[PDB]
Amino acid sequence: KEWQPAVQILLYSLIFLLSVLGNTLVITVLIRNKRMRTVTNIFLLSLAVSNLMLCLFCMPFNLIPNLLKDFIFGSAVCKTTTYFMGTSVSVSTWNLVAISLERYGAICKPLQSRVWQTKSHALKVIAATWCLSFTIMTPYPIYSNLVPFTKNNNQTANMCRFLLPNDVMQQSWHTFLLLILFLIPGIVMMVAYGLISLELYQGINIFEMLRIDEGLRLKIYKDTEGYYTIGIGHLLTKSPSLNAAKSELDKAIGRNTNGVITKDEAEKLFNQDVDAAVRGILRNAKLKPVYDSLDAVRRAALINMVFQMGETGVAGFTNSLRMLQQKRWDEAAVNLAKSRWYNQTPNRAKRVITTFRTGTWDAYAANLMAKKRVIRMLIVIVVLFFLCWMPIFSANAWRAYDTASAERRLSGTPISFILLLSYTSSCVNPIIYCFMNK
């Protein structure tokens, strides 16, 4: 027709510049701001280098020859742009897989797999991803060649084509590429994001709530009351002596801690603490009638209070425990903010009282909600990456099995736009981070 040539220039140019702009924008802000270089964003940086390689060493060398309807570059350029195109897909695919396993480790087995978060391990897999991508994709420059053909009236021209010795090898390669670039990467991705999405669904528990309430302090310190505490809000002694606290501390674990303590000992102590607080609620015969009456998240709010003030300190709140026992939530929330507890620690108390009033985790779900946003962003990046690349890989496979039916139904504009879908992948992710703001 007569529009295709114009629309192709319109579209391929928009896509080329967007991809060049966005990927280098992303490479810039990442090497600039090293606070931004998490483990996640380090694979995101290696994904962005591929997108750029594909935009610069592949997009022109595949559209210009498609517009000219003639491959006017060298035989070596033909071998090259084929080589970087296969490498790009490979790296991107396995970086997405890297991210999914990294997030899985950080969300589903955080204090069980620390190894996969070390940012030196992040540069180890990335180095392995490029190296092995280049190695596995070496048949492209080996078997890529100019195929001479004659447009009408004997005007001789060439075309860059990838031709392995016979039909069986063609079929075996494209089936192998479908396996190691989409089927296997797709399901490892899917099992990971499914488990990630399982944990993130269950939401916030009492250990999460109490971890936000108090943080982690690895050396002795004081509370708003003035008593010595360690780790995640574990009360050592109320005596003013630091010597009685260094003493009570050393007895919490083992060795002479000399004041500073490991994270795994805080967590070991912090689980015994939550153990202690729930045991108190069920041993105090004034709290337990109220505990029984609350749902899971309001139970956690009661556990939070006994964690902070003790079994005996909290059963003192007889007025408020009546109104909770009687499902009167707004009421008991007014009252709890008139207390010394609220006045001593208002931020923590406002949170706990909201939990009591609403029976939800709204007061504590900020870190969870940011995590959900991130994972939902990765699931969109993956899904559009498959959406963008399956067409061209499915067409090359159909060409390796039935070259007649494949070229007869695609060779004009259908493959011209399928190709364009593929190059559109390299400019998708930078627009996605853009919308991840406002």
Ligand SMILES: O=C(O)Cn1c(C(=O)Nc2nc(-c3ccccc3Cl)cs2)cc2ccccc21
């Ligand atoms: O060959 C053509 O000129 C048009 N074409 C094409 C086509 O453009 N195949 C290409 N595959 C890649 C590629 C894809 C994945 C990894 C590495 C690489 Cl290099 C770059 S270009 C397929 C097809 C099917 C039926 C008819 C015409 C057809």
